[PDB]
């Protein structure tokens, strides 16, 4: 429930 | 190389639906984040929504949640932005834009600004 | 939600100047900023991010600073195609910008 996480490979 | 072409805008009425579509070339799209930001004539900017690379987690702004749906077809290269139940202050310019992804060879990792957009789709929502 | 107030609305300036730009942030952002410019019937441009670090392929008269709660661009030189209006953004919690401020030229 973390809308700011890293949404990438890395 | 990097390429983002928007399609699918144009005037709806309150209360129908617009898909918008995002077309992504000359980068690996598929690890990405990808996200929705949008501009109200003579207005400033607003984060809509956000997308996973690997589609898994979504995100969006109160005041499109339950009527707006992000989604992404990475073998096509393309992102999308399903717009229902339309109100007349969805009017906007509708950007998709690559999440700025950075790293370095020092494992320093940053992420959540917006690095490349597409050119913009306007959306008229008017009865 | 963090509310950024960019100051001034606008700047009048002329080539050569420097500009400095300030946005402030309702509670601490940590460094967690980023600047954007945008023309008229354009979309945005990544300046800035991580409050100081500058993007590929942007000038170097262009620069941040800042932490917590107050942060700065600065063009150490104006050049003609910085006109524009600036952004800032912070991805600290959600994702927000402020309202912006137009550079013009002044004449």
């Known amino acids: 429930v973390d809308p700011n996480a890293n949404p990438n490979v890395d | 190389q990097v390429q983002l072409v928007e399609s699918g805008g144009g005037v709806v009425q309150p209360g129908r639906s617009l898909r918008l579509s995002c077309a992504a070339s000359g980068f690996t799209f598929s690890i990405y984040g990808m996200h929705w930001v949008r501009q109200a004539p003579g207005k400033g900017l607003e984060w809509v929504a956000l997308?996973?690379?690997?589609?898994?987690?979504?995100y969006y702004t109160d005041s499109v949640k339950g009527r707006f749906t992000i989604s992404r077809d990475n073998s096509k290269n393309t992102l999308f932005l399903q717009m229902n139940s339309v109100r007349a202050e969805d009017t906007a310019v509708y950007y998709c834009?690559?999440?700025?992804?950075?790293?370095?060879?020092?494992?320093?990792?940053?992420?959540?600004?917006?690095?490349?957009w597409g050119q913009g789709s306007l959306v008229t929502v008017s009865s | 939600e963090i509310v950024l107030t960019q100051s001034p609305a606008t700047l009048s300036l002329s080539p050569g100047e420097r500009a400095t730009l300030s946005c402030r942030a309702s509670?601490?952002?940590?460094?967690?900023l980023a600047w954007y410019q945008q023309k008229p019937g354009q979309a945005p441009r990544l300046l800035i991010f991580?409050?100081?670090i500058r993007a590929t392929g942007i000038p170097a008269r262009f620069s941040g600073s800042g932490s917590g709660t107050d942060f700065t661009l600065t063009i150490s030189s104006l050049e003609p195609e910085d006109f524009a209006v600036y952004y800032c953004q912070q991805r600290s919690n959600w994702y927000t910008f402020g309202q912006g401020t137009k550079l013009e030229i002044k004449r």
């Open positions: 834009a690559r999440d700025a992804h950075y790293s370095d060879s020092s494992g320093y990792s940053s992420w959540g600004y917006f690095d490349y």
């Open positions: 509670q601490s952002v940590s460094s967690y």
């Open positions: 991580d409050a100081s």
């Open positions: 997308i996973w690379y690997d589609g898994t987690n979504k």
